């Protein structure tokens, strides 16, 4: 019975791990694009502002 | 939806950048001619004035 219990616990932990995996999969595709959009906005602001030369 | 939003933002920033590009294009052609007209006026004044020799 306790063997079955440990098996159930490990199954649930596996499910949680896979859920976090899916989270990271969903975050990766768009965070990089947003990072690049931020750099483009920074370039635009640098070209617009008169800060420095 | 947020992906679309970022796309719209980047499009508008592109438009702004191109507008500033057109501004510089319009300024360049005539600022140099005015710079040379100023030098010619300076030469005329130097030949006219009795400052120095």
Curated annotation (Swiss-Prot), chains A, B:
Question: Where can this protein be found?
Answer: Cell inner membrane
What changes when the gene is disrupted? Essential, it cannot be completely disrupted. Cells with very low levels of protein have no ordered thylakoids, are barely green and are non-photosynthetic.
Give the similarity note. Answer: Belongs to the PspA/Vipp/IM30 family.
What is the protein's known function? Required for thylakoid formation.
The protein's name = Membrane-associated protein Vipp1
Species in which this protein is naturally found: Synechocystis sp. (strain ATCC 27184 / PCC 6803 / Kazusa)
Q: Name the encoding gene, please.
A: vipp1
């Amino acid at each position: 019975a306790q063997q079955r219990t440990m098996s159930e616990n490990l199954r649930r932990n596996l499910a949680a791990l896979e859920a976090k995996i899916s989270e990271a999969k969903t975050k990766k595709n768009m965070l990089q694009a947003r990072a690049k959009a931020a750099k483009a906005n920074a370039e635009l602001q640098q070209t617009l502002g008169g800060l420095g030369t």
